[PDB]
Structure formats: C-alpha cells, structure tokens
Symmetry: C4
Subunit: 219 residues, 4 copies
C-alpha cells in the first residue's frame, strides 16, 4: 500500500487540492475578521476550519510515510509540520496567541507553490552574507543601549529606564523615526550634550546600513 | 478619402498641433484652480475646455479609421481613448470625481511625446520583474493585517479595528512613518509585547524592500 | 602690462592667497553669528569684510583682462563674478536677503580649490541623465497637485487650499514625512477614500525615485 | 625572560582567555543595569570588574614588551591601550562619562576577534573615498547653517538661534525627520518663503547622499 500512497501524495492533483484549500482557508480567515459575518456564518466557518485542519494533519501524516527522514531535513516540510502543529493546540488554555498564530498557515501558500519558494529562498540566501555585519551591529546596539540606560534612564525612564527600553528607543532612532522632535530635543532640555551621543550613533548606524545594502548589491 | 486623412493624421503638423493643445489646456487647468481667475475669465476657460474636448474626440475618431484594430492593441492609444472618454461623461451625475479625473488628460503629454514614452516604458518594464516579490509582500501584508486586526482591533479600533484599517496602518509602519511614537508605544501601554509583532514585521518588510531595490539595480 | 599681470594672476601665490582669504572670511562669518562676538569686534569684522570685498573685485577685474571672453564661458568663473556681485549691493535698500546671500561667497572654496571642482562636476554631470525622469515627475506632481487642490482644498485649505500649497504638501508626502498621521488620517475623517489618492501617489513617486537611484548606479 | 613571555602572550590560550573575559564582563555589565541585581550582587560585580581591569593592564603591559614600537603603530592595539586607560581613571573625579565610557571596552570583542577586525576594516576602508563628498557637505552645511541663523534665529531661537542650533536643526531636516510639520510649516507662519530655503536644501543634501551611496557601490 506504500507505493499506493506515494502515488497519491505525489499526485499533481494532491498538491493542487492542497493549494486549493490554502486559498479557501485564507479567504475564510479574512471573513472571520468581520464581527458581522461571524454572526451570520460563524458556525459555517468554524467547522470549515476544523475540517481543513484535519485534512492538513492527514496530509502531513501521509507526507511522512512517503518521505520519513528526508521530510525532517526539508525546511519547507518542517515548517508545514510546525505550522499545523500550532493549529492543533486546542481552542483554549495557555496563551491566546496560539489562536492567532493559526493564521500563519497561510504561509503554506509560499511552501506549496514554487517560484514563491524560489523567491523566499532567493531572499533567505542573502542572510548568511550579512551575518558578520549583523553581529557587529548587535554588539554595537548592546554597547550603546547600556550607555544610554545609565546616562538617561533616571530622568527618562520611559525611553531609557531599562536595558530593553534603550534597545527599543535606539531601534527607533535607527529607523530615524521621530528621533529629534521626539527623543533628543527632549533629552537635551536636561542633558544639553545628548546630541554627542545620538549624532555619532546615527552616523555609525546609517553608514553601516548603507554598506550592507552595497554588499547585497555585489553578491 | 482614407489616404487623404491618413496623410492628415500622420502629419507632423497634426501631432505637434495636438502637443500644442495639451500644454495649453494644462496651462488652462492650473488657472482653473484660482477662485480669482475663475470669477474673471471662468466662462472663457470652460468653453476653451469644451472646445479642446471636441478637437480631441475628432482626433481619436480619425486616429481609429487610420489604424482600426492596430489602435486597440496600442497601450498608448488605449490610454488616450480612455482618458478622453472620462472627459466625455457630462459635468453632471454619478460621482464628481469624474469631473476631477479630467485632469488625467495631461498625461497625454507623456503619450504624445516620445522620450517620455521611452522613460515611462523603461520604468514600466521593470515591473514584471518585481511581481514575484510583490506577490510575496501582499501575502505577508494580508497575513499580518489579519493577525493585527485580531490582536489590537478591540482596544485600538481606529488603527486596527477592521482588516482595511490594519492594512493601512501596516502600510504606514512599513513606510516607517511615525510608527513608534504614533502606534507601537501606544499599543504597548496596553499590550507590553506588541514590540514582538512590529519589529519582526519591520525587519522583514525592510529586508524585502532592500532586495527588491538591488534586484532592480541589476536587471 | 598685460603679460606683467598675466604673470601676477596665474601665479601660484595669487591663487593660494585667494584661498587663504576665503577660509578667513568664512571663519569671520561664523563669528559674526555671535551677538557676543559682534558687540566687541563688530567693527573689526565689518571692515575686514569690506576689505575682502574689494580684494575680490580687484581680482575679478584682474582675472577678466587675463581671460577676456574665455572667462564668461567658464562656469566656475561666472559663478565668482555673480557671487562677488551679490556682495557689492550696498548693505541696505531693496531686500535683506542680499545681505544674507553674501555668505554664498564661501562657495568660492569649491570654485577656487581643485578637487572640489572635481567632485562638484562629478555630481553635476549626473544631472543630465536624470532630466527625462525629473520632467516626468514634475508633470506627475503638477497633475496630482491640481487634483488635490480641487479635492481637498475647501475643507483643508492650509494644506491643499492653493495650487502651490498642494505642491508643498505633496512634496512632504513624497519625502514620506509625517504623511499618515499628519495628513491622510486627518483628511480621512472627512473623505474616507482619500487613501485611494495618496497610496497610489506614494507608490508611483517611490517607484520612480528608486529607478532614478538605480539609473545613477549604472551611468 | 622575553621569549618565555613572548610565548605566553602569543598563545592561543592567552588570546582565547582574553576573548573569555570580554564576553564575561560584557554579560556582567548588562547585569549592572538592573537596580534589582545591584541590590543583591553589586559587590560581586564591582570586584569582578576591578579584577578584569587588572588582568587587562597586565596584558597590555605584557603585549607591549613583546611588540615594543610595533605596538604603538597597530590601530587595534592603540585602541585597546586607550580603552583600558579610560577604565583606569578612578571611579571618582573629573566627569562621570568616564565611568560610563568604560563600557567601550566591550568593543575589544571586535579588536580581539578576527572577521570582526576584517569587517570593521572593510568598512573603515570605504571612508577615504568619501572624504571628497564629506568635505563638500560640511562646507554646504556650514554655509546654510550660517544663513539660517541670520534668517530664522530671532523669531525661532530654539531651532536656529545659534550657529550650533542651526547645525542640529539642519541635520534633522537632512534626515528628513519631521522636517515639515515640525520646522518648515511653523517657520512659514512667519516667513512665507522659508520653503525657498529648505526645499533646495533638501534636494541638494539628498542628491549628494544618493551619489555617495552609488559611489560606494562602485569602489
Ligand atoms: Ca518620520
Ligand atoms: Ca513625526
Ligand atoms: Ca505632535
């Protein structure tokens, strides 16, 4: 019966039946957004939901017999497994991010369809080339975030009071987001020289960031 | 009479005459902005306007006898037809955006003058090569837009209350617009972890965007 | 006496002397900024200034005999003429921008010192290859600025009330500066569909500017 | 005794022991951030700090016998000498930035681990080819900053009141930060033409920066 199912799983039909459900379950999840819609056809789509979820574990069980070890060394398969696994954790208990994390299954449209896989893969592949830089910056952020916490967090604890807060504010400054009118002019009414911290910070981070784009434009 | 008019239409004088009317009517529309100018010479202008509109349909009628099907297979001609058609719906009735949409005829200056055509075409041609990425993005946006509506729409209905609002807000975050003081710091007064939703969102979206710029800086 | 002065003007000493005055007059202009400095050495500097102004016209007078027509066809020289000219309009009558426009003479450091001429020229030379785009864009802005003045200027006259205002506001959206919370969300409290105007505007304007950067990174 | 210590210093063990102290002290500094942690283990971590500070001077003393003059011509070594020296200045007297500047030693993780060294050097190397643009710009900034102080600093002293203030505000405009609703629209309530100063300023400054990115993507 093994080859019987290896023929079912690998069937163009099967993969297209899968892609058909993703597009349906996605259309259905956007409808679950409507407080109106749920009052009318809520029970329709709760069931439609549990239905698709079963079908998906059935596939994943089926997909594993056909592939075994090869399957748990496939990124896309591992993914598909974990994204359905999330979707199996009861509609209750623990955290309710798990209910919300269920919509991650629409990323299966990326998995199940090539060209997407190509594109995602194309993208992901650029990351290893960025890791020396990314490491550098994260060291850098860590260093300034400490500096900022101990220089400004007493008077400005919303923004710098804690190591994590400083990470966040520094991230915001880095996105050049509302940084002057929002953070540093305020800081300067108390610490006139705060500009000496944030201007060099900005330079380094924007400089570095430009290089990283130029590096991604030579690989 | 066909070759008589094919010799009229294809004439340098004709095209240049058309280009003459565009720049005049365009000048004319900027004057139609002034509440002052309109009290003085408003009548002068609406008639010159209707005049121009006639002249333009005559041309397009003529242009078609001289090209027949070849015409409705020309992007630039199709454009011109559709823009004048917009300008044909009476100043009355339905939606009044139609009166406003008239000013789209000044895009005929792009259409009637080469080099522009060159540049537009040059630009537009880059688009097909982005569609794999644009699909990827739209899926991403759809998925996060759904999560956000269900994670934040109850306490923050202005920004996330509805799927469309979430799309808009997410777009705003993506343009890195006033995203921290404006949205996430608020969000966090209620949902301390909202940073776990928006920073990864910001990274992915900015990463994808960098790749897409480099993809262009190659093809 | 021509060759006597053609030997004075073309001299290394002459040029390095000019450069020495520029850096000094520049230093002297940053000091004229301080109300403190001006209350104690204000006279020292106003005269130093009137001095340097003569020295510069003398040079330009000298420089002209030595080059004649060749001069009024050199970009860099023409510049220095007009810049010193600005500095000759008496400190009074007319407008006071002319007094402020005097500090433009510090651009002579670019004009009179090689390398800067190199870099400026390197930069400027890129401009011709952007002109098809710059035109394209201005048509676009002109068209949308007209649309916006008639779509939003009655309720929002600060921002869209006049053709030029729409130009300014549109510029701001294009720099993606404070565009959503500052302008479109407010606009949407009255015109729910305003998002239909500004999102496409943003896309086009952003797309085009990316291409333009890429164009420069080819030519 | 030289070859004995030259064999201690040059050892894989020594270097990796150094790398071990950095990641330990760095971890320990993140803990010194917590007001909680300090109330429990502050003594522990103050002493651990002085320990590491000794060990680092010992090394720098050692590293110098083994290299002599070769050492004070090594950038990376020069760095470490200075960085430890900052950490030597008592935890009292002078300023308190000297206490804060101590966290700079964690940059030794860049200095004491290649690839980092590689990456930093890769970056720094890009600088010399920017200095022609960078010089140009600071002239540009200096010129406009002076203009702005005399055009806007009387009615608007917080933003343009002083040359230094104009530099800061001009920087903010350059990052295009909240430049319009924050600065130029206000300015225009008093000086309608202030847009004539800031729009060109914006163009020039962004153009130059676009060129500089393209330059770095050539060399
Ligand atoms: Ca901003
Ligand atoms: Ca803002
Ligand atoms: Ca505000």
């Amino acid at each position: 019966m093994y080859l019987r199912i290896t023929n079912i799983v690998e069937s163009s039909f099967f993969t297209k039946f899968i892609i058909y459900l993703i597009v349906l379950n996605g259309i259905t999840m956007g409808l679950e957004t409507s407080k109106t819609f749920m009052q009318s056809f809520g029970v329709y789509t709760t069931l439609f939901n549990q239905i698709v979820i079963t079908i998906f574990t059935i596939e994943i069980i089926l997909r594993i017999y056909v592939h075994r070890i090869s399957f748990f060394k496939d990124p896309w398969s591992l993914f598909d497994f974990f994204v359905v696994a999330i979707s199996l954790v009861p509609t209750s208990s623990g955290f309710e991010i798990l209910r919300v994390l269920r919509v991650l299954r629409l990323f299966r449209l990326v998995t199940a369809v090539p060209q997407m896989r190509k594109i995602v893969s194309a993208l992901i592949s650029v990351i290893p080339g960025m890791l020396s830089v990314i490491a550098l910056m994260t060291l850098f952020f860590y260093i300034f975030a400490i500096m900022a916490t101990q220089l400004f967090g007493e008077r400005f604890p919303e923004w710098f009071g804690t190591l994590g807060e400083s990470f966040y504010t520094l991230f915001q400054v880095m996105t050049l987001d509302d940084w002057s009118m929002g953070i540093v002019r305020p800081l300067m009414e108390v610490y006139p020289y705060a500009w000496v911290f944030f201007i060099p910070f900005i330079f380094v981070v924007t400089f570095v960031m430009i290089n990283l784009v130029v590096a991604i434009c030579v690989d």
